Amino acid sequence: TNFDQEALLYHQQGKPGKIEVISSKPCATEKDLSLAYSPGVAAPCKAIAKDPAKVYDYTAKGNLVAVISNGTAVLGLGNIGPAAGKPVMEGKGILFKQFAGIDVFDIEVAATDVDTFCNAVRVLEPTFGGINLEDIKAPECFEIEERLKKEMNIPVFHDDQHGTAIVSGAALLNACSITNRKMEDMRIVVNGAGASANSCAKIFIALGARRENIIMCDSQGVIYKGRTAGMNKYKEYFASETEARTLTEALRGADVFVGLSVAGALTPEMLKDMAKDPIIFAMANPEPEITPDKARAARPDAIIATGRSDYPNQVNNVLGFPSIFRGALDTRSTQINEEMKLAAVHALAKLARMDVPDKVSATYGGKSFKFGRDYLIPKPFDTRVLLWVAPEVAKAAMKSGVATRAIEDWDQYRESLEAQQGPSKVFIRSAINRVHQNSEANGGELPRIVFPEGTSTKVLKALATLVEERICQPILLGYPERVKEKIKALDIPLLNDVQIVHPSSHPKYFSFVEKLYSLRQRKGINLGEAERLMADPNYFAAMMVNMGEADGMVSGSSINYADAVRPILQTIGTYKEGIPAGLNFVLLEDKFLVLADTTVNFNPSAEQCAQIALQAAKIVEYFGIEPRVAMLSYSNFSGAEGTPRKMKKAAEIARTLRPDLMIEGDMQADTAVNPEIMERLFPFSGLKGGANVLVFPNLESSNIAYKLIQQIGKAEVIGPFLTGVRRSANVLQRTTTVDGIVNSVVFTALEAQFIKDALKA
Ligand SMILES: NC(=O)c1ccc[n+]([C@@H]2O[C@H](COP(=O)([O-])OP(=O)(O)OC[C@H]3O[C@@H](n4cnc5c(N)ncnc54)[C@H](OP(=O)(O)O)[C@@H]3O)[C@@H](O)[C@H]2O)c1
């Protein structure tokens, strides 16, 4: 088919291969090269000589894992040599980085001999922090893995050996917990004994099971002690003394069936002879041992957990090894013992026993997952796997004593793992922590945020994420029966105690109408119009925030920006001199930039531009950053008629209002953001160090710039966030994702807290 040709093109387009080695530190200036190389490179080397433990602090040893192979068990191809298995190694390293943020040096060793292979790997100690054996044929894999573990003083893990056992072991706990099948009376049969099967039997035994109920099969029927030594000695370790010697006979009364063999190894005769709840594992990749559709045609009580991406409960190795190595490497452990492997088994099992956010669903075609029978293990592309399995593996290293580094703060450890998702995740987590610390000084009082669109799916999905973070107390607006129907349909268990208010049925509804009428009676609104407006949730939510029934509101997900801002501007107002304005955060690796005004004012005047700068400067001061404001123009300090004169005057007005801030203009965009340009060309400017607040002359420039930065610049931009309003209120867009709604609610909660304490003082 075209898939194989497309794969060849994927490995040949542009740069051949799939990996690239780049520098993580500045290496452009001569000073940069002198720091990275001689004579600056000698200083880190001296420290490692005195203290060998510093090799984990000055080099990339703490994040480097070697995927070493000899190419004798490359997938289903078999023994194709080490060079032919190179693309598999490169793909394995990609999975390591994409799911655990681990740098990988893939190694192919042209030595099929066990003794030669072990000596070559053993001398590679001072390079890598861990070794990942992969695609090594039996029985050579067992002997290589054992000696390497004893000799090498760094974690050694054969993914083909233990990786599948951990994922299947986690599924077994989830499968039995929904069938009342206590492991003490739990019969296990593994068909196709080999590299993975031996570890699977050992893993199950460590999971409260006994070898007496475990029987292993082979191509020559069912093996047992009566067989004349079978093959090798590894499979003889778990061999039982059961008289049965046929897969048909041995599967009678078998609680589970682990199909780690070739395709077409199941018959309906033993499919209807296992138990009241049989658990089967169709692990063969080229073709499943038993198709789930065929199994469903048989006894429906058969729990099926295959190993293919086209069916539920896929057993994927990518769930086990990235998080396990991340936990071992972060704790600087010296081994990957059974204690840590069991921790990953438990962590994966508990993770499936949890709610599935829309991020997992949207990744897999927008499906639904619950802890039932079609979802027994976390999905391979689930982001939370690293956030849950890795800390569990890290803890097991501490309790087993292998770990040589201490993780005292565990909340910081998860947010360090979460920080791998980008600067936007870091920025929002910092804002979430600020909300928590603001609430902690307020006595644990979370802000109340009302949503006029409780029927909206994106708002409801975002609220599922927001309640777990303890950011706010959400209030939904609408018919309680109509929104609870959608809450149940979308299956959020956390959104069950959430308060739902119908505007017309509220006890304070008629008091709200009188307040709206008194505010708008000489602005074209009569009593009949006020009653009709107050029935609209957007107007009702604005009056709850204005009166005090809520601290903030988030709307605009189902209407245009202009139609959603209007109730906020009419019910709530602006402050003494405030002006409504949209605000965007441009999140860079080192700093962040504030852009205003991006959504409201078409052509602000000099007085309005100065007010916009002051509002944006206060938002920057929320985070403890010193605001440095630049009025943007197409010219550099000219004051010519039009925009340059307006922006020059805007800076003068703003400096008068807040004389303790760095406000300057008019400049160009590159002059504002580059400190080197400012010092070289305009040393007279009062703005030093670069601007972090950017004020635009009109809406065309501000809107186009932040949308071009988001698209072309590939920088993280979050917003827009409404500013200049008397109370906390934010307006979404129809195109906002649930992640953008989460950021908007976090900003609304942050602004509500600041408005609350400012009003308190
Ligand atoms: N996705 C996963 O998590 C995962 C993990 C492991 C394996 N698998 C799949 O499961 C299969 C087996 O694993 P493997 O790669 O280790 O296999 P393998 O050893 O390469 O070959 C299967 C072995 O099982 C035995 N066997 C062959 N046909 C059999 C049959 N009809 N009934 C019973 N035993 C039979 C043979 O043992 P003798 O050599 O003693 O005759 C053979 O060596 C492969 O298809 C593999 O891709 C999937």
Numbering used by the authors: 12 to 772
Show passages lifted from the paper:
While reducing NAD(P)+ to NAD(P)H, MEs catalyze the oxidative decarboxylation of the TCA cycle intermediate L-malate to produce the TCA carbon source pyruvate and a byproduct carbon dioxide (CO2) in the presence of divalent metal ions such as a magnesium (Mg2+) ion. The hybrid-type MEs consist of an N-terminal catalytic domain (ME domain) and a C-terminal activity regulating domain. The PTA domain does not possess an enzymatic activity of PTA but acts as an allosteric modulator of catalysis; that is, binding of some metabolites to the PTA domain increases or decreases the enzymatic activity. Binding of acetyl-CoA to the PTA domain is known to reduce the catalytic activity of several hybrid-type MEs.
The cofactors NADP+ and Mg2+ were added to the protein solution prior to the data collection. First, we collected a cryo-EM data without acetyl-CoA (BbMaeBholo). In the result of 2D classification for the BbMaeBholo data, one structure with a fixed orientation of the ME domain corresponding to the H state was dominant. The structure of BbMaeBholo in the H state was determined at 2.59 Å resolution. This result is consistent with the previous crystallographic study and confirms that BbMaeB assumes the H state in the absence of acetyl-CoA.
